Each structure stands twice: as structure tokens, then as C-alpha cells.
Symmetry: C3
Subunit: 142 residues, 3 copies
């Protein structure tokens, strides 16, 4: 059993290593980030991530944020994050409903005045509140 678990864990690290080495994904803690390289709107990204068994990416730590930023930088495009504006303007929540804890707004943001209910990440990693209909890099977390 112990010999079987080792082998299983070894093989997992091998496949994760291969995917990591080839830039197919980024591992941060227990979270894995990945993109299909496509630029689509918020609703479309949501579907793509869930179809793959994951969710539209959302950073909850500075290290997770930088990981997504590096992907945004790599593809030279902004990234829609897994959060939307509440009823009260300026207040945002994760898709499960919980209010956002970690934030990294670009100075002055959010200021869409309730008209920009989605959140995009600039290539430097800072956030901007934005309409949900733009074409943005699809980044998922697993």
C-alpha cells in the first residue's frame, strides 16, 4: 500500500512536472493556473473553465496574483478574474457570493460607478473594474 501510494505520488509529480516545464500551467500552493490562450468575454471564460473541471481564476494571495500576472504578461492581454460587483457599487464578491478579501486595485480603481461589474487584471498585475463583454485572456484555476 505504502509502496503503491509512493508510486502514485511519484507519477503525479512527473505529469505535473512535464506540464510545468512546458509552460502549460503554473502551480502556486495547492492551486494550479492554466490558459487555453483564447481571448473571450466573461461568460465564455466561465463556461470554458467549468467544462474543464475548473473555475475562472481568482487570486487570493500576492503570490497567486503574480502567477496570473505572469500569464497575462506572457500573452500580452488582460485577464478577467473570478469576481463581480455587488449591488452596492465598489463592492465585489467571489462567484460563490463571499465578499472579496485580497485586492490589488490599480490606484483609483474601482471607479466604474456600478457600470463596470467585472474585474480585469492589467499585465502588471493590478486590477481594474470593467464591463463584462470585452475579449480577455481565459485563465482558469484548478
Amino acid at each position: 500500500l505504502q509502496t503503491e501510494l509512493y508510486e502514485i505520488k511519484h507519477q503525479i509529480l512527473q505529469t505535473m512536472g512535464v506540464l510545468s516545464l512546458q509552460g502549460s500551467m503554473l502551480s502556486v500552493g495547492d492551486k494550479v493556473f492554466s490558459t487555453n490562450g483564447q481571448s473571450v468575454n466573461f461568460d465564455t471564460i466561465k463556461e470554458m473553465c467549468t467544462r474543464a473541471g475548473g473555475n475562472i481564476a481568482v487570486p487570493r494571495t500576492p503570490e497567486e496574483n503574480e502567477a496570473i500576472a505572469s500569464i497575462a504578461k506572457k500573452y500580452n492581454n488582460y485577464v478577467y478574474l473570478g469576481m463581480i460587483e455587488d449591488q452596492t457599487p465598489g463592492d465585489f464578491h467571489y462567484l460563490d457570493g463571499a465578499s472579496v478579501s485580497y485586492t490589488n486595485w490599480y490606484p483609483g480603481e474601482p471607479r466604474g460607478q456600478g457600470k463596470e461589474k467585472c474585474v480585469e487584471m492589467y499585465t502588471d498585475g493590478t486590477w481594474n473594474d470593467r464591463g463584462c463583454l470585452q475579449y480577455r485572456l481565459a485563465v482558469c484555476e484548478f
Copy 2:
């Protein structure tokens, strides 16, 4: 132990998620379909799949069939399936020897009269009996 199994299962879903998101494979039930994008003959596909630890794909449900059809459609090529004609013309078997259950013949097929011992899938998902020497998209199941 339970904490170790969760982590293992979590990491598996992560790697499967990454491969899924990037179109490297399709998951249907307990079956995974994948292609190397190459177009070769029946014998060559057989070898490639087994070298990868899998088998030349064969659909046994409508959902498995549509999955392979989507790959055929994606690469704009027909797909050799994991089945060949018996001694009696019009009767086909899986490679283990068992007679074919689920079928999706294009109307009028099979009618190769025993001269077309292999089976190819059109891009709409329907089947045609065919000679085994054509260049076809290599699709494997794992």
C-alpha cells in the same frame, strides 16, 4: 491517509483539467480520447496508441461517438476505429474479438462486401467500412 488521498485526487483533477482546457484530450465517462494529430494507416495507429499505453479509439455509446466525431471534425479528417470485419462480410468485431454492439453506420453501410475490413468515422460521426491502408487521423482511448 484520507488527507493524502484527497490531495492525490485533487492533483489528478488539476492535470486532467489542464489537458482538457488546452484541448489535448476529451474525457467521456471513464474513457479519455486523444490524438497526436497524425494521419496514418490502421496498423500504424494501432502501434502508436499501444506505445502510449492506450488503444485505437472505439465508441461504445452515442456520447463516446460524438466525442470522437468532434475530434474528426476538428482535424478535418476521418478516423479509423478500433474494429475490423469478421470472416462473414458485414459482421464486425472489437480487437479483443467480441462482436460490435453499438453502431452508427452511414445509411447503406457497411457494404464493402468483405473487401473493406476496416471502419472509418466520417466527420459527422457516422461510420463507413473501408480498406485499412488509407491515411486517417490517429485517435486513441485510454
Copy 3:
């Protein structure tokens, strides 16, 4: 439990199968080889492999050697191996410090006279001792 371990092992083989079929890696025994396709110096390859959770590749059997050779052949470039010269010229060690067992030197090699502390693999699989600053295919083992 036994049903859970089977499923886990099945899914592992599926992901390994997909990666194998698509040429993303080579499996030899319990060792997996992979490349990101990049050509950089020894120190850079070392870092890339360890960042992915692996190590710069080193063959310890003829089958492992041929596996790496095939990758070298595929990318038409030589490969830096995971070994460097001791203080005594002509003597080489693995990166953990242990002296090299299996070798496959091209005839006459090594003869860098202590000036060529790294080891490169030619596309035919044979070894040459070389300076560590050249651009070589980055191949990792996991």
C-alpha cells in the same frame, strides 16, 4: 478503497498516456524525460528543471541513454547531461556527488584535460566533455 486506488491509477495512466502520445514526454522505467525545447547553458537548464520539480536529465542505463538521444535527435541539438568533472580530470560525478557509473563516451572522450567540466550528448547518443556555457537542449528527468 481498492476501487478508489484503481480509479486513481487509471486516471494517472490516462494523463501519462495523453502526454506520451503527444510527444510531450518519454517514459523509461520509473523515469520520465521531457524538454521545453529551449537551448540554454548548463546553469540555466539546471534551474528550469528544478523549477518544474525535476532535475537535469542523466542516463544511467542504455535505455535511458537512447531515450535522451531520441530527444536530442528530434530537436537536432546536443543535450547537457546531469554530471560534471571532478577535481581529477577525466573523472565525472552526478550532481549529488556520486561518481558516474554508466557511461557512453564517444571514442577518445573525455579529453578536455579538465577544461571541459560539463558533458554533452551527441545526437547519436554518445558523450563529449565540453565547457558549460554553450546553448544546449534542456532535457529534464522526473
